[PDB]
Amino acid sequence: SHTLPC
Amino acid sequence: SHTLPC
Amino acid sequence: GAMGSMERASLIQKAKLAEQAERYEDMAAFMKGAVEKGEELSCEERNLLSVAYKNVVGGQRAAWRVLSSIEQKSNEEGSEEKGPEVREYREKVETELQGVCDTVLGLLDSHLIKEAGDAESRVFYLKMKGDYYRYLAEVATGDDKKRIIDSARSAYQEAMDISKKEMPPTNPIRLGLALLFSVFHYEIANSPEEAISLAKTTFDEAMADLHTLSEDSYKDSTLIMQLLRDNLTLWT
Amino acid sequence: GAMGSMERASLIQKAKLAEQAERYEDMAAFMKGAVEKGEELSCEERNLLSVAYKNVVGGQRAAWRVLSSIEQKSNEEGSEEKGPEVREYREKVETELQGVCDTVLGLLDSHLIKEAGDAESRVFYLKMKGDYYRYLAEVATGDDKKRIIDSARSAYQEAMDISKKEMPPTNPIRLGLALLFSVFHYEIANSPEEAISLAKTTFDEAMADLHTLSEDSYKDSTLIMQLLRDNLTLWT
Ligand SMILES: [Mg+2]
Ligand SMILES: [Mg+2]
Ligand SMILES: [Mg+2]
Ligand SMILES: [Mg+2]
Question: Which residue positions does UniProt flag as site: Interaction with phosphoserine on interacting protein (chains C, D)?
Fold first, then answer.
């Protein structure tokens, strides 16, 4: 799953 | 320039 | 602290050099030094502190996941016994990662959050508090696991309540908070329908507010919206 | 040393876990611990020690090159004065990299090289000695710079003399030594024609001996030959 910051 | 190991 | 004799401005300058040199352990130690000067952080400084610690903990979380996977395989039926080393080394990486999360949480508590009155700073720090409890929850397995999950939850929920009152739905901090909290619901809280609801609602509310943006703000907000849509694609 | 209470076999096992987890600082500290047990290293163990330290020093050399480039730009005409920080941080990374090269050289001297009697081990360690003096020479600018270059040179030349007497021209250690020494001539010793001669001669002598190899040995040797050819393309 994408989360921020990278 | 290439050298080894990486 | 080892950075106590360095000027605040020189710590900031060296954190930006360390970022260019791909040396985020160094970057995070310069930014820790800068926070410990006791002054509030500007927006750019707040971004340098979060990028530095995210890259330090990201390498730790990647290693922990590789070691956990080897340890879980070692623990199946018909798997050959290899001794305590995978367990010990997994624990060494876990303890290191716990220590970096404790350090970031300690900076937020002493005393970045209490001194943050504007919504952009307070939401940013409470999102970070939720993120670093979330990385603690990712490795927790003991009597405090529930409590670590609740501390993440609480922090994200206070940040959401302020963001929804004080920021537009396209604000990138509000969007990255919602992205992060949706992943907390999916991966940590075992609440996939709350995750998908929050990502959908956040995406649709931001879409409806794009028309108010400049070209550069549009590009900042749509980049994050695409991450929400990519998670929704991976979850539905 | 902090690894003195760990079994030799458990240090080797943890170096291989640390490699899988992309945690070569850890990998290099486990392999340093293993060398300090005092026993000779097997071929696979020798490979783990060289991969660990190469990845640690590789990140240091990449950062040093980014910081050197910023520092050299800062030192041109019409460039704004920014204080001592780029110089200081370049120096901090340089000193760190010097310390890792000194640590590897110290392991070779105490006492890996003196205890290596077979050609494969002795050539491997002398190549490493040449490589780590070469990384010292890459940052040297003082009264010992000539001497650091000569120490690299000497080590590579002793390794070449043993390799040419004891190993076939397709042996991968002999090929990687020749690759490395050719780059020493081009980049360090300001001898591009010696570099190109050594890479051409090494490539042609290996070509002529491919017919003796199995499929798997062929693939090992041709991979290195292609690096020689890629350098020759970049130099001619
Ligand atoms: Mg001051
Ligand atoms: Mg304030
Ligand atoms: Mg023993
Ligand atoms: Mg011997």
Answer: 61, 134
A3·C230 Cβ contact <8 A = no
Contacts C67 to D, Cβ<8 Å: 17, 20-21
Which chain D residues are Cβ-neighbours of B6 within 8 angstroms? Answer: 51, 54, 58
Residues whose CB is less than 8 angstroms from the CB of residue C120 and which lie 6 or more positions away in sequence, other chains included: C43, C167, C171, C173
Cβ atoms of C159 and C171 within 8 Å: the answer is no
Structure resolution in Å?
A: 1.5
Q: What residue has token string 């080897």?
A: C70
Q: For chain B, give the residues followed by a break (C–N over 2.5 Å).
A: none
Domains, in order of start, for chain D: 1-236 (1.20.190.20)
CA distances for D75 relative to C19, D79, D84, D93, D137, angstroms: 21, 7, 11, 19, 22
Any idea which ligand is nearest the CA of C11?
1
In one letter, which amino acid is D168?
Answer: P
Q: Shortest CA distance to C89 belongs to which of C59, C64, C56?
A: C64
CA–CA separation, C181 vs C18, rounded Å? Answer: 29
Give C-chain residues touching A6 at CB under 8 angstroms: 51, 54, 58
Q: How far, in Å, CA of C174 to CA of D101, rounded?
A: 47
3-state secondary structure of C81: coil
Q: How far apart are CA D15 and CA D55, in angstroms?
A: 13
Neighbours of C73 (CB within 10 A): 10
Give the number of other Cβ atoms within 10 Å of residue C118's Cβ. 11
**Residue C8, number of CB atoms within 10 A of its CB:** 16
Does residue C22 contact residue D59 with C-beta atoms inside 8 Å?
yes
The tokens of C87 are what? 């367990």
- The CA D7 to ligand 3 mean position distance, Å, reads 5
Method: X-ray
Q: For residue D60, give both structure tokens.
A: 């240091």
Burial class (CB in 10 A: 0-12, 13-18, 19+), D8: middle
User: CB-based contacts of C231: which residues, under 8 Å, 6+ apart?
Assistant: A1, A2, C179, C182, C183, C186, C195, C199
Pick the closest to residue C94 from D21, D49, A5, D25 (CA basis): D21
**C200-to-A5, C134, C236, D166 alpha-carbon distances in Å:** 20, 21, 11, 68
